[PDB]
Design a protein around this ligand. Sequence first.
Ligand SMILES: COc1cc(-c2nc3ccc(C(=O)NCCCN(C)C)cc3n2C2CCC2)cc(OC)c1OC
Length: 307
Amino acid sequence: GSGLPFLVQRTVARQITLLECVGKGRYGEVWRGSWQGENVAVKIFSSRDEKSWFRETELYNTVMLRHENILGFIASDMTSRHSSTQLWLITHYHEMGSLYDYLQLTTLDTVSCLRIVLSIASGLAHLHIEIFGTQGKPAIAHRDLKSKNILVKKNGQCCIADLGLAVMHSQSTNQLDVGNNPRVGTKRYMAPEVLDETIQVDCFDSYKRVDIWAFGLVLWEVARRMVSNGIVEDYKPPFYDVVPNDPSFEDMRKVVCVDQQRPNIPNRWFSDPTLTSLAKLMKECWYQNPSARLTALRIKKTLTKID
Ligand SMILES: COc1cc(-c2nc3ccc(C(=O)NCCCN(C)C)cc3n2C2CCC2)cc(OC)c1OC
């Protein structure tokens, strides 16, 4: 699969030392660990998210998922630390952390903004594309794409993380694993058809289009932090002004379904050719009609032409 052979995976988990706790949330904890003096990221799952640990483990072990813009899987184990049994996911360590946190610490210029959003689009296209053959992969929809689930590399590229809610489709299998309620991700980023539960739960391409909606929101988050003529916006989450923290489903439905509202475009973006192009791009990710939204490959192409 994507990481070490399973025999090595078990020995690796035992050979890891946990050094520093860099993240904690409802998902559990993330640690900087060390394997033979090399940094690794270790996510220790909460009981609430144990099923996501299992789903992500089986995905990465059974699908060859190696791509510069997807978080690099190393191993998964149910191991003991300090006499407690724990669910570990071990990946490449990205010292910069999440795009969410990174955007609050610094600003971007044209080159670094485009590098971020193109690398996300490239990772998303690779997830979404079904590749046939013995070394191919099922199509994968992420279902919780957002800035907290994107990591930043030292070179300014990003990679998409956290495949615990992902759904997969092969020409072979017919029954998607939609898993009952479609409202599984983060409410602030949910597409209208998820919020109002009209999404065709049996149609795999419906889930790709939900990802595209969320990507447009991430594009907006990032573009706010690109400086033009010494001007930048502060970091804010999508819809931060029109809904409260931890917004309810009903909060989101009124904004996105009834009123058909979208994040506001700052006026100054139309003084800059890159931000003007990005504004147009994100609007093509947010159409109410899911089938009108651009594909990840079309977004990737457009971003490549902007530079
Ligand atoms: C091993 O599995 C995972 C690991 C990571 C992950 N690696 C990380 C590596 C470093 C850091 C992190 O802050 N260093 C300190 C630098 C702080 N700067 C914000 C300035 C934070 C990391 N994090 C998450 C982001 C919140 C905690 C994220 C995952 O899903 C989003 C994940 O699950 C697949």
